[PDB]
Structures are given as structure tokens and as C-alpha cells.
Symmetry: C6
Subunit: 226 residues, 6 copies
């Protein structure tokens, strides 16, 4: 009887039999501006606020203060849950408060330390391209992804990793090999208007819907519709 | 008079005159989430449970505890058959990897073998394109062992990820997801199948509570 | 309340809840001749004339006299506002480039910045693909300056020339030329804008005697 | 009068004015599972049985026992004709490979030759792209032997895998699988044949219990 | 108040408000045989004959005697105007090539310049991709000289052969051949044109006994 | 008043105002088996037989004896004109008879010598890919093409060069830069049948037809139709 992590996104859990199987790494993929960051933030924020599960949002796309400001526009008070120790933001430039002190191995050690310090049940790495673009050699993302996979398996948290391609499921062709779930966010062209769609392409241990579902990014975040 | 190895997948054997010809290496290809790991698990697991044939499931995609756990969602108790010595799950050194599968296959007298997946091997090499040399080395031991094997590979067009996998298989099975009208629907096709007048049609299938079923 | 920077482009602000969130880096992308330089130049120029906001226009695609003469054809007198200290035109050493932009921005207390263009920077490097490392250095100084910036890039498919520009922007505007049936017509689309419920539709626009006008 | 070598494929000779001009090197190309090995094997086998003409089948895609067992499923008894000296099966050092083919061909006075396949040679090289230099060395020995040869290559677009194979052939046969509407159906087309006014149309064919049959 | 340089091509000036803005570098792009060399010749040759403006035609595509000979097929006597010192034809050392065009342009007080073609330069480099560095060097002297220049490039989609040429031009003219129904018909389009509200329509043209004519 | 070289191909000269301008290099391009070799051979053979102009056929695609045998199937007796000195075939393995003794510079010297020895007015190089595939480095075809161009200009003969692509006009993207004429041979798909078409894409000094023309390879070679 699989334990399920509620996504935090109204309309979504019903597509995946109540939520993500505990312990799954989910690849959230889509083009620029399809809602990846938002959807990942909602997962962590709602995890903490509605379901009381601590979460770590790792970002190399922006700084922590950018994410707090941006998510405030949905009414989400990240800093409130940070002071309560239910959320940490790892950007790192700024060390998480209370957890002081591109280098891949330090990075991964530090995410592991922070997951363990708050007893995180939820984790986001936004994004894989943000990591890759910071390496000496962008194609070593291959070796970095295999190191990440090893620490995800050890930590056993429920994780969203984001990646970005416009055919291709992912940017590098590798990201999907370390994920047991895949969610696509898209903007379809019809006919002078782009509407947002989500599709669950893959989800382990789950008889998930295989249909495209409309969605909106509203004043209170993502809502998925019939 | 070719001896046939039953797939374990309802609706599938009838497409290939009763089964896989014994000793064949079969390439199982399809995009992410098209049912490859499930198909290969079903072939090993029903081999043991229903046909009493020992089998080896080699996974570099995940670990044995993940595979056991995921497969119980379909009613399949992999550990029961591991302790009876009817299934082994094998969880980068290429030559040792190969030696070890060889030894486990002999050790349990396997008749079925799965390697899930070729990309998973290749992504662990120092240079990913050395999968070419690795595949030729793997072809050589498959030929020695003479078991019935499913290798999995994954491409989005192109039949395989590297354009090489198909040169060491004598059968190819494609799993797919099609567009219709705002739903994704699953299909299987036998592209090639030595010694067999197999169907060339596309068939719908479902992945349900008892795993894969192929329809008319 | 998010504080917004008015574009200077008639018909455009209502597409983005009144203007660009202050401090945003916006990528403006489009093929040759889709109107990127004019859009950028209008943002800086109307910022100075219409709203009093000082602005820096960095160009490696042309010299400062070229841009002055060219924008005069729209009735825009750049030199007037340069003399009043409300516009600076900045006309290969990457670190010195970046330091200089930061200086000029500070010196006039700039609220607006344009860099025209990312490709024009890349093409002057020892190795073109080092734009990746250059774009990362730009990002850190944009985040430090906290001004409102337009960066242009050019491709006609792909969003950007290099596949990297979009990762340092929190807004994306696409300018396009569509064929219908004998004639190319200009369209703008807002692909991304942080903190903004923007329109997602394609709008027609034209470049006329007073620069860009976006239509319903 | 051009002397022609009868294919052994029912329905095919009439497409090429009765057969292959003697001494021609013919490239047979097609995707995985389009029937290239069967076509080649039928050319050698029916050459021996039907016309008395001795033939060499070189394969790096499988072992000799594999091809014997596989072709038995068509009622073809390769070993009978091997024992009578009318068929040789030749089952990485390029020069030694080539020398050996030339020897076996001379030893049985072969009129027919197959090499299955060009990719299977390329994939065994130290560097795959050295097939260019290998194909040039093959060409010179085919021209010396003056037998009638089929070379296979595989791509599904491009005519050949490497873009080079076609330059050492004076005939080209394409085997294909076309979708209609639920089913893959097999077609053959003669793209090129020297000294021959061949048909230029696509013909259906099937692989049945007696091998290939081409239809109107 | 922008000064305009008449094209010399009937039907074309009216598409660009009377002519090219003085000092502009114009990229003229199109596939093989779309009329580029003819268009550029016509611009230099009518410049001299009809408008009394000196011009330089730089060709690395062919030699001066070929160009004179080909152009007389259109009634154009290039040598007459070479001896009056109103046209020069310039027939690998990059820096010397550049120095030399500079000197010939000064030497005859040229107002018009053609370089036919960018690919022709690039194909003569030690490394063809150094055309990037060469183009930036050429941009620097075009900016110094301030003449009105047509550069030609050739791509089959992509606007240019290298994706770089368009970053040193402030106008782009596309010449094309379209499919209709079993004939190829010629068209011209102005993609971009600084300082000009130019037509965005596609226009048919003919290359006749008097060279290029543009139609409605 | 341009001097014109009659192509030798019935139905063709009318497309190019009576023939090729004397001295032109023409790129003959098309996919495998579209008639390139045949069309080039007809030009040389008919040049010699019908119009009395000596011709050199250079081939690295096949040997001279292969070409004589192959062209005999059209009724063309190459060896007859070879003994009369009106045609030479350069393959080279075999030196042209009477002109004794991969190396690029030797190659080009030898074609120049043979053109000059028979006072050739016609030249064929079948094919550019055949040269390129024999080089140490296939991409040096670029440098080889510029050397070829220099000797073509010096010799002033009327030349066909053949190249082979299936979008792309040529195999390498370079061949068209040394040619002042381009002819495409194609096979169009309609509807289970491939029919042959020729199109003149470019021809210097000529108001050539711009239409696709059907053609056949018949028992007496190419014939082009209305
Ligand atoms: N508060 C808001 N209200 C409504 N929509 C918003 C709001 N903030 C941002 N958006 C929308 O969400 C988008 C940002 O999505 P984002 O999650 O950053 O995409 P990605 O990470 O895929 O590039 C904006 O481009 C905008 O369309
Ligand atoms: N227990 C379940 N019940 C129904 N469907 C399931 C169940 N578990 C997994 N699936 C389906 O099977 C898919 C997993 O298939 P999988 O064999 O891993 O594909 P692949 O290896 O090609 O990526 C999931 O995406 C889901 O759709
Ligand atoms: N003064 C003008 N009046 C009307 N249209 C103009 C004027 N100047 C330029 N244009 C039009 O605007 C275009 C300029 O586009 P530009 O901003 O330079 O595009 P980009 O930077 O994307 O290449 C010209 O191609 C022309 O079509
Ligand atoms: N005994 C048989 N009877 C009928 N069909 C067969 C038989 N054996 C093989 N086939 C069919 O012929 C195919 C063999 O094709 P093959 O010659 O090996 O193709 P290729 O070399 O191009 O990959 C099999 O995929 C199958 O469809
Ligand atoms: N004197 C002529 N009369 C009519 N058309 C001609 C004449 N000379 C050349 N042409 C046409 O012009 C074409 C040459 O155009 P050109 O300017 O060289 O194109 P490009 O440089 O783009 O390859 C020839 O292909 C032919 O169609
Ligand atoms: N004597 C013949 N009679 C009729 N057609 C022939 C004859 N000889 C060859 N052909 C046709 O001509 C073709 C050969 O064309 P070829 O000039 O070698 O093409 P390419 O050099 O473009 O590959 C053959 O493929 C065949 O269709
Ligand atoms: Mg994001
Ligand atoms: Mg799998
Ligand atoms: Mg611009
Ligand atoms: Mg085969
Ligand atoms: Mg030209
Ligand atoms: Mg040929």
C-alpha cells in the first residue's frame, strides 16, 4: 500500500492516485516559462504550510531573496516557514541560517546536510541546466547526474528535479535516466493564444492518467482543471 | 522445428508464432515510460512463476530493492522466487560486469536474461561512445551463453539510442505512445523476429494491476 | 504591490499588468530585422523623455553615432537627453566591459539598461562558446545593479542563439515575422514575465514613423 | 549481349531484364528487419541449388551455424551445398579478412558473393569512420575478382549508413517497410542498375515460408 | 533627412523609399543562381553609367575578365568605365586583401562597393570558420570608409551561410527561387533596411537582356 | 556573340540557347543513379562522334574498361575514338596510351597534360566525391577544389564536374562555388513510380529555361522531352 506525498497543486493528485509515491525522483520538464519553478515551489511551500512536511528548495537559477520575493506574489511567505525551520532555501551563495559553511561535491554534501538537519521529506533542485552551465565542461553533467542519483537514493526523500527543452524530453538526454516519474509542462499554440497543459508521461507504482490537462497559473499558484 | 520461449504477456505470444525462438537476443526499444522495464520484468517473472524457467534481471537503472518494490504493485513477488533460486537480480568495470552476469546465469542455470538498460551501461562509461566496443563484447557472451535475452534501449525516427544495439539483436520490439485526440495510448509492434512469420501490425496494450496485456 | 517600469511602447504595458517588474532582466529575442534594436532603444529613450528615468544603452552591434542617426528617423533626439545626463550610450576584454557598464549605470543613477546584443559580444570573444562563462558573469552584475534591463539575442525553433541567454532572464519577449500570404507581418509575444499575469497571445505590431506600436 | 545472373528471387529478375549483369557489385540497403539478410542468402542459396553457381556468403552479423539454422526455417539446406562445394560460409584485421574472401572465392570458383554487412565491418574497426578506407580496399578486390556481389548496409533520407557504400556499387536495391494504415508492408525498389533498363517502380514483396516473393 | 543611393534596378528603389541609405552595408543573400552577382554588378555598373558614382567590384568568385565578359551579355560595358576610372574590379592574406580594397576605394573616390562573396573569402582561409574574425575586421574598415556596400552570401531556413554575415549589415535583401507548378520563378524581398519603411512584400523579378527588373 | 558547345543530348540544347558557353565549368548534380555518369559520357562521346571535338573523361568512380563496357550498352564505341585520339579516358590506374607516367598535384598535372596532348575542347571529372573519398582527409576537398578551379580557368575547356547529394545542391557545399553552370538530375516520386527530371538551375551568359523537364535513359542514351 504505497505511501503518497500530496503535491500541493489543486487538481493534480487525482491524476496520480492521491500523490507521488514516497521516495520518488520526479523530472519536471518543459520550455522556458511553462511553470516549472512555480510548480516546484508550490510543492515545497504547500508541503510545509498545508501538510507540515519540511522541504528543501535548492536553486542555482536565482538567489534565495529573488525566490521569496517572486513567490510572495502568490501569497506564499517562504521566510515565515524558514524561521520555523520547515523550509530551507539553498542558493548557495547564502548559507542556510543555522547551517554555516563551481564545486560539485561540496554542493551535494551541503544539500545532504541540509536535508538531514531539517528532517526534510521534500526536495527540489531547480534546475539541472543551471548546474550544468556552471561546470568547467557542460557535458560533465553526465557524471554529475550519476553522483546526484547516488545521494537521492540514500536520502530517500520525494524529489522534483527541473530541466528545460522546447521531440526531446530533456535538455541533455540523461536527466530521465535518474527519475522514476516524468511530468511535462507545455504551452500549446491555438490559434493566436498559448494555453498551458500538464501531462504525466511516467510515474512509477501508479496507474496515472495519460491525458493532457489544461492549467493556469493564478493569484494563488497553479490550478489544474478537468 | 524451432523451440519457442513464452513471453509471459497475454496477447503477445500469438503475434510471434507462440514465443521467442530459443537463444534469441531481443532489443526492446521505446521512449521513457513506454513500458520497457515492466515488459522485461514480466518476461523474467512469469518465466519463473508460470513456466518454471530460471531468469536473471540485470538492472543498472535502479536497484534490486526498487525493482522488487515497484513490481509488487503488479502482484509480482520477486523475492519469493529469488530465495527458491529461480530469479536473480543483479544490481564502472565493463569486463567484471560481463564476467559477473556470465557467472550468475551459469550459477542458476538461467534460461531467460534481461539487461535493463544499454543506455544505463553507456552513461557509466568513461566515454559514452565506447558503448560500441562494449556492445560487441556483450554480443560475444550472449552468443556463448545461448539464453533468451531482452536488452532494453531508449530513443524518442531512430530505432535505438546509439544506432548500434540493433546490430546485436535478432528481434526488435517497439513500444510506443501515440497521439489521440488529447490522450496518449500505448502500442507495441514487432519490427523484426528471426525464424518467425510475425505480425507486422501495431497492437494496443494496457499496463494494468496484473502488468501488461496486449489487445487485438 | 509590485513596482512596474513602463515600456515606452504604445499598446505594450497593458500586456504585462502595467509594466516590467522593477529589477527584471528581460530577454528580447527574434530574427534579423524583427525590431529588437528599435524596441530596446524605445525603452531607453521613452524612459528618459516620458518618465524622467535615466537609461544606459550598451551596443556592440553599432557605434553611438550610428544609433543616434538611426533613431533620429523616428523623431528621437538621443543627444538632447545625453546632455541632460538622462541617457548614456556605451559603444575584447570582458571584465573591463562589465566594470564599465556598472560604472556608467552608477554614474547616471540608471533605472534602465539595454545590452544590444548577446551575439555581438559572443562573436568578439576568442572562443565564441565562452559566451556561457560570459553570460554567468553578466548575471552576477545585473543582480548586483538591480536595474531594469533588456538583453537582445537573435535566432529564428530555438528561443535564443546559444541556448543559454534564457537562464539569466526572468522575462522573455519574442518578436517575429510571419508570412501572410505575400507579406511579412510583425508579431510580439510575451513568453515569460515573473510576478506578472501577462497575456499569452501573439499581438500584431508595426514600426512606423514614431517607432513601435502594438495593436489588439 | 550482357550476360545476366538470375537472382533466385521469384518476381525479381523481370525487373532487371532477366538478372544482374555479371561482375556487378550491388548495394542492398534498408532498415532493420527489411529483409536484407534473407534477400542475400536467397541469392547465394538459389544460385547453388537452382543454377549450379557456387557462392560465398560472408557474414560478420552472425555465426555460420546461426545462418544455417535461420535459413532452414525457409526449407534451405545450406550444409548440403557446402558439402558439395557449391556454397562457402565465411564467418579485427581488415587485410586478412579481404585476403581470406579472395581465397575462398577462388577455391570454389565462386560466381556469387555476399557481404553481410558493411556496418558489421565498420563497427569492429578501431575507428568506425575508417570504413571509408576499408570500402576503398574492398572495391579494388571486387574489381579484381569480377564476381557478382551483394553488399548490405543499413539506414532508414540517407541511402546508406555512412554515405560511402553507394560509390563502390553499380547497382542499388532498396528494401523498405511502409505504414498502411495499421500495418507495415514490405516494398522493393531498384534505384540503380548499370547496363540495364530496369523498372523504377516500388513493388510489394513478402517473406513467406519459401523466402522472398516479389509481386506486380 | 536621409540621403539615398539609387540601386540601378528598375522597380526596386520604390520598395526602399528611393534608395539605400548612404553608408549602409547591405547583405545580399540567396541560393546558387538566384541573381546575386548580377544584382551587385548592376548596382556598381548603373552607379557609374547612370548616376556618375565611382564603384569598386571585389570578386573572389571569378576573375575580372570573366565578369566583363558575362556582363556584356546584358549590354554592360565594364571596361569603358574602368578606363575613365569610374569602376575598378579587384580580382590568401586577409590583412593585405583588406588594405588593398581600402586603397582602391580611396584611390578612385568610390561611393559604391561590392564584395562578391563572403563564402569565397571564407573558402580560401586556412580555417574556414575564421570567417568570423575576418568579418569583424571587414566591418571595421566598412565603418571607416563610409561607402554604400553590398556583400553577397549564399545559403539554401538560414538567412546566411555562416550565421554571422547579418551581424555586420544594416540591410538584408533576399533573392529566391520559388516552386510553381513545375517552373522556378524569381523573387526578391527586403527583410531589413535601416532608416527605411520598406515594403515587406515578396516581389517577382526577371533577369533579362538588360539585367534585373523588379515587378509589382 | 557567345560561342556554344552542343551538349550531345537530344532535347537539351534548346534549354540553354543552343549549348554551353565555351569555357564554362558546369556542375552536374543529383542522387545516386540519376544519370550523371551517362549524361557526362554522352557529352564527351557525342562531342567526339557528332561534332568532332576531342574530349577527356576523367574517372575515379570506375576503371576505363568498366566505362567502355558500360557505354557500349548505348551503342557508344569509346575505344574507336581513343585509337583515333579524339577521346582519352583517365582513370588513372592505366595511363592513357601514348602518354605514359592519392596524389592530388600529380592528378591535376596529368589531366592538364592529357587535355593539351589531344587539344581537348571537352572535359569531365566524374566525380568530386570520388576524389574526396580518396584523400587522407575528406574535408581537404575544399583545398583540392580551389586547386582544380585554378587549372580549369587556365585550360579554358568546357567542363562537366559531377557531384552527388539526395535541400543540399551538392555533397560538400563547395562544388557550386567553382562552377558557372548547375544542372540537377532528379527522380521524383509519383505515385509508385520514379520518373526522371532535369532542371537547369544556373547557366552563365544564358537565358535558360527554369522549368523541370522529363527525361529518359534509352537504348541510345539520354533524351530530354518537352
Ligand atoms: N503572481 C502571478 N500571477 C499570475 N501569473 C504569474 C504570477 N507570477 C508569475 N506568473 C506566470 O508564471 C510564469 C513564470 O513561470 P516559471 O515557474 O518561472 O516558469 P519556468 O521555470 O518554467 O521558466 C510567468 O512567466 C507568468 O506567466
Ligand atoms: N502499479 C501500476 N499500475 C498501473 N500502471 C502502472 C503501475 N506502475 C507503473 N505503471 C505504469 O507503467 C509505467 C512504468 O513503465 P516502465 O516499464 O518503467 O517504462 P520504461 O522503462 O520504458 O520507462 C508508469 O509510468 C505507469 O504509467
Ligand atoms: N525610420 C523608420 N520608419 C519606419 N520603419 C523603419 C524605420 N527605420 C527602420 N525601420 C524598420 O525597422 C527595422 C529595424 O529593425 P531593427 O530594430 O534594427 O531590427 P533587429 O535589431 O531585430 O535586427 C527596419 O528593418 C525597417 O523595416
Ligand atoms: N521462417 C520465416 N518465415 C516467414 N518470415 C520469416 C521467417 N524468418 C524470418 N522471417 C521474417 O523475415 C525477417 C528477417 O529479416 P532479415 O533478413 O533478417 O532482415 P534484415 O537483415 O534487413 O535486418 C524477420 O523479421 C521476419 O519478419
Ligand atoms: N545574358 C543573360 N540573359 C538572361 N539571363 C541570364 C543571362 N546571363 C545570366 N542569366 C541568368 O542569370 C543567372 C546568373 O545569376 P547570378 O547573378 O550568377 O546568380 P548567383 O550569383 O546568385 O549565383 C544565370 O543562371 C541565368 O539564369
Ligand atoms: N543501356 C541501358 N538502357 C537503358 N537504361 C540504362 C542502360 N544502362 C543504364 N541504364 C540506366 O541508367 C542508370 C545509370 O545511371 P548513371 O549515369 O550511372 O547514374 P549516376 O552516375 O547518377 O549514379 C541505370 O541505373 C539504369 O537505370
Ligand atoms: Mg524557472
Ligand atoms: Mg525502465
Ligand atoms: Mg539590431
Ligand atoms: Mg540482417
Ligand atoms: Mg555569383
Ligand atoms: Mg556515376
Amino acid at each position: 500500500p504505497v505511501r503518497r506525498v500530496k503535491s500541493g497543486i489543486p487538481g493534480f493528485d487525482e491524476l496520480i492516485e492521491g500523490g507521488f509515491p514516497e521516495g520518488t525522483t520526479v523530472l519536471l520538464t518543459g520550455g522556458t516559462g511553462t511553470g516549472k519553478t512555480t510548480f516546484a515551489a508550490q510543492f515545497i511551500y504547500k508541503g510545509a504550510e498545508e501538510y507540515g512536511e519540511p522541504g528543501v528548495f535548492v536553486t542555482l537559477e536565482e538567489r534565495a531573496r529573488d525566490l521569496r520575493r517572486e513567490m510572495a506574489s502568490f501569497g506564499w511567505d517562504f521566510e515565515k516557514y524558514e524561521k520555523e525551520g520547515k523550509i530551507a532555501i539553498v542558493d548557495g551563495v547564502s548559507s542556510v541560517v543555522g547551517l554555516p559553511s563551481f564545486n560539485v561535491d561540496n554542493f551535494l554534501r551541503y544539500i545532504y546536510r541540509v536535508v538531514k538537519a531539517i528532517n526534510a521529506k521534500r526536495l527540489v533542485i531547480d534546475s539541472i541546466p543551471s548546474i550544468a552551465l556552471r561546470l568547467e565542461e557542460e557535458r560533465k553533467i553526465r557524471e554529475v547526474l550519476l553522483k546526484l542519483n547516488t545521494i537521492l537514493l540514500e536520502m530517500g526523500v520525494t524529489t522534483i528535479l527541473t530541466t528545460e527543452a522546447p521531440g526531446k524530453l530533456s535538455r541533455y538526454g540523461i536527466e530521465e535516466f535518474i527519475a522514476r516519474g516524468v511530468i511535462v509542462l507545455d504551452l500549446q499554440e491555438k490559434n493566436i493564444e498559448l494555453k498551458r497543459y500538464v501531462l504525466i508521461r511516467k510515474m512509477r507504482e501508479t496507474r496515472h492518467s495519460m491525458k493532457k490537462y489544461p492549467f493556469e497559473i493564478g493569484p494563488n499558484g497553479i490550478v489544474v482543471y478537468p
